[PDB]
Subunit: 254 residues, 4 copies
């Protein structure tokens, strides 16, 4: 018989990568509010300290680790520490990422490769590191933060789009390969999200979006909790777009 | 600040079409459990009486109406009655449908047209009938029950696939056209669902599905509540597949 | 060993529905230039006479018939006449269609149903009528003229989008069901095509399109010949978009 | 006015990467037959010598170079040599690739990264190297060899699927970013192709495929020539699947 308790993350541990601020912080905050214990990593101590204070201010007793997501040995060690200090990771959110804006033919091979490493290879490293324990626990969730660039291209973001497209298929592959072990791997694909770090451009976004507003990180919270919960146990290899209708809409024409 | 209350349908009224048994009944039951008031229709009194008893047995005080979903005048009148006797419909689930299995070249034009009328035209009639009041209430949800046949074809189900493909685009169109009025129109696309009314075929389904089991109507409840709730307010024109990984998977090969 | 002759339609007969002017005329003209014999239908004698003169002026000896595509008995009789007077139809292009622009809630059920009948049901009627002879000939092609509205919605075009979405799935279904009989059924999905019957709107289209121009009916000719030919024999249930990059592009932002 | 000459590659130079045997060789052979001058690269002299002899036997005067596609400096130098010895590359086919079959959690980070480097990063390197000259010539084509794994996952092929998914989005990005410079970048996505280097598995493939046969490299020739030619000039950011209907079909059930 259905219960709203199917949405609850009580008793579960979630690792959200790069969750010191922004979208990762918002998803982790919502997870905590839904009942979860929060663990997170970032590239330096300063960012970790920032996230730790922000969690504390929100009433959340988070566990923060310095670790590069592209460092497999580092990640494996971090997961080992989390398991001994906190418990088994039930839910992984691959949120850590970078973006570069550079005309493709101007982009150096090193810079292209670096965006691929963090945005595509790293979610494989982290997923790889958490999956064995999820299988033994008898249930896992892996939520990959995708993008509208998992679907559509744009000048200057070639590396990013290639990575997010790859991450979309990595999601479908993990679902296919580990679905039988009761791992659900899905994507959240944010539309246009109004960040601190961001008019004709405003009119442009508003026109493209049926909802007729920018999204906010708060719009991602419900969808992210749904995918981390028992309420989505038969949702697998699926990219949940949270874009107020952008991907469905040809656009507001004159 | 996030709350699990975003998943609650307390204080809301949902119309689920054809919800006397099966998947419609399961979605309506879950909606009631999530807090909603349930209204539903079916083609004859007998089916309505069946649904009414089943709701009562589940502890749900449902409101049932005899109405053909392809009868616009009938539907408009029914919505008028629901508004006077129960209240404004906040949530519509276009669940009523038929399927026929007939080689396409053997299918009569009347039979093709009939599957189209019920499975595609009727959800437009019903959506049309509820949208004006949703706009005035300041929020609406329309959930269209799609299919894997919204994406993939099969021998014998030409009319059904054409209808479900159409319903997929009708969903994206309603999102595009009414998203600005705070209507979210989305799809639920069930995978293989074990019904009462249904081994090498068993092996076939199990192999195709990463989850390695048939779905059940219970698997649709969490996804359907999510789409009817405030937790998905920035999800629009989106087809949520609930298939245990089928659409993501090339298949279990020898 | 590969030959460019794989693109040739020499010795083949093509039926293009509604091919008296516009996109249908351009596809039929190209088919004739590629070697094909052209047959076509339209709703009245006047349109047929128009197409007949235009073909003659282009050096093409076309065969024109008055027939409503929603009239199955009429279509079956027309195919019977074409078979006795011209030969077996090797290639069908479902091009005939209508569009209406009407806010969905303002659209009458009759008008919705009429767009569905012509744009979705009729291509099933016509496909049904040609498939038996294609199977006996040992090869058939059916090209369905889809739209960007097979993928994306817009205000005022609800019925049209629902039909084109349906037509997309009808294409995939015919492929699935008749592919084994050596029928290839595919779609052509035109982007923005500059028609006679059509500035900030100009800037809008140009920005949305990587190619940075309106498409023209001439842009559809190569893709349509490819799909009607031996060069695409292993292409089946596929929607070939011809849009200069629109569907791939998030858009030219400020 | 349409001509079949729109399919001709006369007067054009094509670079097909890794085209010493297999699918690359078949596409290059067809390109030569369509009128093109053939250049190709492979990882060692032995493979190059093999391709060179096979071209000669087919009546084709190919130009072969030893170059690793992941070596940007090497690729840039090779393109410089091709330009001085042969001419400007009008058409690039990113065909070079590797596949590994390894359960994801068993896959080393080095091996994952290597499949990504060759199958995703390398097509960016090669595209980057040819685009400036294409722009100056006033027309370019880039055809990326994708896969059904650009769309669907499977056990053991996580890295490959992630790369091909990425390559799909890289294609759409190049289209978006360089479409205005009259570059058309598209994908060919082969279905199941019977290779030398390859029964219940036979029954499995035959059932999944509406065409009810394995594909062959010859099935890719027409689609590949179409995408390299003037006949597809308004086709951009598009993945042309050549799979006999697999992606359109739910499967042949018992
Ligand atoms: N509009 C949007 O914001 C938007 C839209 C769609 C999708 N997304 C995706 O949403 C996710 C997060 O978005 P956001 O904008 O809030 O944050 P964003 O700038 O990606 O940063 C995410 C976090 O990842 C961390 N990080 C970067 N590289 C790392 C590494 N190698 N190892 C460990 N941590 C690393 C960052 O540290 P630093 O402070 O040093 O960078 C940052 O704290 C990303 O996957 C992004 O691509 C964002
Ligand atoms: N495996 C599955 O069951 C599956 C998988 C994917 C999608 N779906 C979709 O899920 C939805 C419901 O599935 P289901 O299998 O539980 O039920 P299903 O047999 O479609 O029946 C749904 C209800 O619709 C009613 N109905 C039919 N025509 C009507 C009309 N013209 N006016 C009003 N009501 C009408 C039916 O009455 P009757 O008893 O007289 O038919 C029945 O009570 C449908 O849209 C279906 O296409 C089902
Ligand atoms: N921008 C575009 O033009 C565009 C873009 C994407 C897709 N398409 C699609 O391309 C196809 C043709 O486009 P178009 O703009 O050149 O022509 P369009 O106006 O659809 O007209 C096509 C032809 O269909 C005929 N027709 C309509 N209903 C019929 C019926 N019931 N029986 C027989 N014939 C009928 C029309 O006669 P009437 O003169 O009486 O209408 C006309 O000659 C259509 O499927 C359309 O939806 C067009
Ligand atoms: N069933 C299929 O065959 C199938 C289906 C779908 C897609 N595809 C795709 O079609 C393309 C070619 O298929 P295929 O099976 O004929 O060949 P495949 O084994 O990928 O080999 C392609 C060629 O790429 C060369 N290559 C590998 N790494 C290279 C590098 N780093 N630098 C330069 N060249 C390199 C290979 O040399 P080596 O001999 O040393 O490996 C080989 O000659 C690939 O992109 C593949 O992923 C194949
Ligand atoms: O060029 C850009 O800035 C990108 O397109 C962003 O606007 C994306 O929308 C976002 O980073 C998606 O993930
Ligand atoms: O031929 C059939 O019976 C259909 O393919 C069903 O099995 C569908 O899976 C279901 O009705 C989808 O909506
Ligand atoms: O509202 C409109 O006029 C439609 O959106 C057209 O512009 C379409 O682009 C074309 O008819 C597609 O088939
Ligand atoms: O595991 C495998 O062997 C792969 O799935 C192949 O069968 C693919 O079909 C082909 O390599 C696609 O590119
Ligand atoms: Ca985005
Ligand atoms: Ca289904
Ligand atoms: Ca269109
Ligand atoms: Ca493949």
């Amino acid at each position: 018989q259905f219960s709203l308790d199917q949405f609850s993350l009580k008793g579960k541990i979630a690792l959200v990568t790069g969750a010191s601020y922004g979208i990762g912080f918002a998803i982790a905050s919502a997870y905590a509010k839904a009942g979860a214990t929060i663990v997170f990593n970032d590239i330096n101590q300063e960012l970790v300290d920032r996230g730790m204070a922000a969690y504390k201010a929100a009433g959340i007793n988070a566990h923060g680790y310095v670790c590069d997501v592209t460092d497999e040995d580092g990640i494996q060690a971090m997961v080992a520490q989390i398991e001994s200090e906190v418990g088994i990771i039930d839910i992984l959110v691959n949120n850590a990422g970078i973006i570069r804006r550079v005309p493709m033919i101007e982009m150096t091979a090193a810079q292209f490769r670096q965006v691929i490493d963090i945005d595509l290879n790293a979610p494989f490293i982290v997923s790889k590191a958490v999956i064995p324990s999820m299988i033994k626990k008898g249930h896992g969730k892996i939520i990959n933060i995708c993008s509208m660039m998992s679907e559509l291209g744009r000048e200057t973001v070639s590396a990013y789009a290639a990575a997010k497209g790859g991450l979309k298929m990595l999601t479908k592959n993990i679902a296919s390969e580990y679905g039988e072990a009761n791992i659900q791997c899905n994507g959240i694909g944010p539309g246009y999200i109004a960040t601190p770090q961001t008019h004709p451009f405003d009119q442009f976004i508003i026109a493209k979006t049926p909802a007729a507003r920018w999204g906010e990180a708060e719009d991602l919270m419900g969808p992210a909790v749904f995918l981390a919960s028992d309420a989505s146990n038969f949702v697998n290899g699926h990219i949940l777009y949270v874009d107020g209708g952008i991907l469905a809409y040809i656009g507001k024409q004159p």
